[model samples]
Target: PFTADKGKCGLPEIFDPPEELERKVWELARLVWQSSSVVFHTGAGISTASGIPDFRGPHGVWTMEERGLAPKFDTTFESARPTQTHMALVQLERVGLLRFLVSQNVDGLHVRSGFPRDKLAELHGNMFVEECAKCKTQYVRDTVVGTMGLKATGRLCTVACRGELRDTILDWEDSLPDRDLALADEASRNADLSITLGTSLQIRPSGNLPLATKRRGGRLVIVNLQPTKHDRHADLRIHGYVDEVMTRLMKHLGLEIPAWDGPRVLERALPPLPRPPTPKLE
Candidate 1:
């Protein structure tokens, strides 16, 4: 007698869970709907629908951990992109219920998904743009990729200044941006509800948001395939695919989920921007 709770549901070994978990996940979604303002903290799992692989899964980077090539904080943002799940958050933000989103992902998918820059706190930084080392000026990907590409081709730095180009993401030795941290803290403190999706809650400063919200008397809800460190503190914990759960939850909350019927009229006229050009240094 194989029970719904007996088998894997499309994730890696550690992330594998029973089919019965979906029911609890639905309940979690309902709670989120009932709240006024919500903050979503996301991680790699949310991008799986977009064909991106989870870092610790069987086919993920961790499988080859012994090779010392496993992905670390050094993994570049160019390797990750926004997925359907990220787009869902964009929709949620557009609708105004999503108060703020604090993410650990450096893929810059939230921006690509159309989320507003002010409302999102990329605690881990982003890949779509570069920040000047000395001036701290933010440069859009479109502005610098060309020069970077030239550098990649063994061309000398064409930009007047010797400004270094680095992803907006926070590196191993870098500190989290203070302004972003304060914004996240404020949003978490004020939110009536906090929803954590896709993240394992193991990462750090970004992982601290849920706890902050919980401490502020906000309801904490977690949606992930695996049990997180905050499971005991969460008001509700749902285990399932992020996209499917969010779609169903939004529908239940009287929110319309737009159908993606291939390319749209605007999409035909406006193709996506190309990947940031990587310049070769001579």
Candidate 2:
């Protein structure tokens, strides 16, 4: 097993006192209820409960890599299920509470949760989505795309254009997708409230999206165990697990968290090819 070198990684995880956590969560619920447009900025922290490790955390993959150790994962991409936090976002969108979701995660949990495709902006690219450059069609695969950093996936689009399909995942210094970036930026600017979950807001461009809301005289709320880069700008900061915070927030909002029924693809192509259903066993 690999261990994180404290000196190389970020500060240790810390949680808010139980009473303060409750108070902050209640306030967040009210903000969500009152705001006309709420945008969520999610990161790897939101999916940690789904067995994925987050970067910059105590035992994060990058943290361990800093110590010259191999990364460890508790679950594979195929087996990891969407956590309660992921499902909560789906419920929020369903009731029109959340206007849009901006995620820096490539794990594909939000999409797998059956969240609406048009409203989500995956800034870092998804491990399951590949794009056709010619027709601009995207296919959400059941398995990992097998490449990263916008490399070609050795697959052709189902459309007549026969364009080369490229993985959407980005490497450092990559330019964000034009379509997703525009949507996220516009949504952030229009939001009355921006809630950031499970991210330290360290990455550029995408991380700064929440500030768009603040510049527009909107409220900002942050939910993360570690202090974020923009903590000073947050109207409210709650240091806690994303899953727990989302659970209580949903309760206070008088909404039930939606249940994940399994993998569902929200494709962007016309006359799409149908995904095969998972087989049942005796």
Candidate 3:
């Protein structure tokens, strides 16, 4: 009923029917079952349900900006919780089914969801992370970093050197971090099954990493409501809300989505970062 304004940022949305969705979910579950190593790519769409806005959806922040309209925000970055899709990913990794996760969003929900740091590559950086320029130690915070574009966050490293700490979030045109991109590239190339969730496959190297799997005879599955840059390349394409698709896919695979208890910081330095006090839930 809707179409993408090809001249602008709005991408047409598509939703599969229940029966078709069911068939695809089963097929995807089988792919997960038959594959030994699996990796998935995530984007802003995966975090939208957590109240963050995706960039290219019909009413996305960037899309609205293109239309000369103001965008709406449902929640602050600090207050948003991980979505069902995020929790499902955590469960998938916990069960040893997901080999790696490559994400393009800076929302920091994956780490907030407690996914293992070593297994995830945040190609766009995280809003809750700051890195020491001198020692390269990363501090994962429970609150959002005060700045982006790799600017100094007015904090010093807790280490003896007391180096200045810079925000990890990248701005447009910034180069992707070599360490995270390298890990993602290797994982994608090694995977037997590469599934992309909620991403439109528009960005560079990060978007193209899934093709690395396809190049090696690995199957590629794409789950998104909008047509992606690589739709023709997908072995299976399911159009639906990521949370709904993940929920059904997990059911088909006989897995449970883990519940988020609270925020837990995963760090990359000596003497683990001190835990932040949990806010009392009403």
Report the number of the highest-TM-score candidate: 3
True lDDT of residue 231, candidate 1: 84
Q: Candidate 2 at residue 81, lDDT?
A: 96
Model 3 residue 185 CA deviation in Å: 0.3
| Higher-TM-score candidate of 1 and 2 | 2
Instruction: Tell me the TM-score of each prediction against the true structure.
Output: 0.72, 0.90, 0.91
Q: Can you write out model 2's per-residue Cα lDDT over 78-162, one digit (the tens) per residue?
A: 8999999999988787777788999999999888888878889999999999999898898899999989978899999988588
**Candidate 3 residue-wise lDDT, 169-262, digit = tens:** 8776689999999999999999999999988888888889999999879999999889989999899999999999899988876777878887
- Per-prediction RMSD in angstroms? 12.3, 8.4, 8.1
Candidate 1 has an lDDT of 0.63
Q: Which TM-score value belongs to model 2? A: 0.90
In model 2, how many backbone clashes occur? 0
How many steric clashes does model 3 contain?
A: 0
Cα distance off (Å), candidate 1, residue 208:
1.7
Q: What is the RMSD, in Å, between candidate 1 and the native fold over all Cα?
A: 12.3
Error of 2 at 161 (Å): 1.8
The lowest-lDDT stretch of 10 consecutive residues in candidate 2 is 272-281
